[PDB]
Structure 1
């Protein structure tokens, strides 16, 4: 009788530059029963406790196949994960993917 939140997106690869990175991902296998509305990316520098997060429109993300994370520091290793938002709320977070920003 009730829809749930989406299953997890999958991160394929991350293409990092100096202060930004392109996160390549797959849509959830299951929407949960109602449509994906937004994506949330969360990232943090490995070793640190604080997570940074940003919302992304579902339409452009799923069409481009990417979300772009910003405000990164050069030469630094990060963990990133993704979750889909539907009408019920936030779904399962993806497995974390680790990348390193390039040197300036």
Structure 2
């Protein structure tokens, strides 16, 4: 049967935030079967410098499970596979996610004691999924913000969050932020609207 040097594939970049496990995928096709080693800065992993790492091997892929603790844990990692015929390496970048960019408020439609805030999702998730939205509102000329959190799926599927407990004939400012696993993102500018009588 057909022998060949290992052929590797997997994503270019993998995103996470400090303290959060993520797996880097190294899929391998080789005959005869290959031995897979993971490297960073020339050393086999886990190493002294990169110690927050476990490897999960399966017949079709090796997974490097990395839990970054510091800035230095982000950067390039290498999967190398070796068999009788030769070797191949694939380089991955572990990227530090950002929090999301700001949602944009499109329109606010006030509905006695409530308001429907129509919004556009952040232009950038920061590399990991948006999990929730936070809305904050306050009557114009108050300092204290009221807030409510919304699941990101329900919110994004209609592009609306509904704000509640509003007083009639009152001008409010409302602003919106998106939360991903790393934390809360940039908060939108506040938009003003007035509730009905």
Instruction: Indicate the TM-score class for this superposition, using the shorter chain for normalisation.
Output: over 0.9
- Counterpart check, 1:79 vs 2:187: no
Count, aligned residues: 102
Q: Tell me the SS of whatever aligns to 1:62.
A: helix
CA RMSD of superposed structures (Å): 0.4
1:5: which partner in 2? 99
Per-residue deviation, 1:100: 0.3
1:69: which partner in 2? 163
- Structure 1 or 2, whichever has the larger Rg, is 2
How many Å separate the matches in 1 of 2:175 and 2:143? 14
How many Å separate the matches in 1 of 2:183 and 2:176? 14
TM-score (norm 1): 0.97
How many Å separate the matches in 1 of 2:182 and 2:133? 14
More strand by share: 2
How many Å separate the matches in 2 of 1:49 and 1:3? 32
TM-score (norm 2): 0.51
Per-residue deviation, 1:52: 0.1
Map 1:47-58 to 2 at 5 A: 47-58=141-152
Per-residue deviation, 1:18: 1.3
Provide Cα deviations, 1:38-64, integer angstroms capped at 9, x if missing partner. Answer: 000000000001100000000010001
- Unpaired segments of 5 or more residues in structure 1? none
Per-residue deviation, 1:84: 0.2
Provide Cα deviations, 1:36-92, integer angstroms capped at 9, x if missing partner. Answer: 000000000000011000000000100011000000000000000000000000000
Name which structure has the greater RCO, CA cutoff 8 Å, separation 6+.
Answer: 1
